[PDB]
């Protein structure tokens, strides 16, 4: 078991480093966070900000989610993130990823009581 919140933190949070450590960051991180378990998760974003900072996005700018739900929120400040994108030659189980660092606003969907991030919707 794992809550939706816990799962967001496993899939999307990496406060430990300020930036995308290396060209190899996604290869290691996607595997270690169990995102390469039953398939190669095609794309995935890691956020290098404190949990509190990311949690607080749930009270920031309310915007439409990509699926049309209304519970998405855009960060008023840009945040340090790393985008992981599966390569063209990547073949499960040896999942291969391109690691791209950026500073962008994040959009998360929040749910629950407490109202916390449960999905990563977009970066802009
Ligand atoms: Pt902006
Ligand atoms: Pt999701």
Curated annotation (Swiss-Prot):
Q: Glycosylated at which positions? A: 1, 7, 34, 37, 41
Record localization: Secreted
Active site at: 12 (proton acceptor), 119 (proton donor)
Q: Indicate whether Chaperone appears among the record's keywords.
A: no
Q: Which stretches are transmembrane?
A: none
Any S-S bridges, and between which cysteines? 26-84, 40-95, 58-110, 65-72
- The organism's place on the tree of life at top rank: Eukaryota
Q: Name one GO cellular component term.
A: extracellular region
Enzyme category, top tier: lyase
**Quick one: where is this thing mainly located?**
secreted
BP terms from Gene Ontology: defense response to Gram-positive bacterium
> Which reaction(s) does its UniProt entry say it catalyses?
an [RNA] containing cytidine + H2O = an [RNA]-3'-cytidine-3'-phosphate + a 5'-hydroxy-ribonucleotide-3'-[RNA]; an [RNA] containing uridine + H2O = an [RNA]-3'-uridine-3'-phosphate + a 5'-hydroxy-ribonucleotide-3'-[RNA]
Tissue expression: Pancreas.
Q: Which UniProt keywords apply?
A: Disulfide bond, Endonuclease, Glycation, Glycoprotein, Hydrolase, Lyase, Nuclease, Secreted, Signal
Residues that coordinate or bind substrate: 7, 10, 41-45, 66, 85
| GO MF term list | lyase activity; nucleic acid binding; ribonuclease A activity; RNA nuclease activity
EC number, UniProt record: 4.6.1.18
Q: How does it assemble?
A: Interacts with and forms tight 1:1 complexes with RNH1. Dimerization of two such complexes may occur. Interaction with RNH1 inhibits this protein. Monomer.
Q: What does this protein do?
A: Endonuclease that catalyzes the cleavage of RNA on the 3' side of pyrimidine nucleotides. Acts on single-stranded and double-stranded RNA.
| Entry's family note | Belongs to the pancreatic ribonuclease family.
Q: What is this protein called?
A: Ribonuclease pancreatic
* Parent-protein start and end of this portion: 27 to 150 of 150
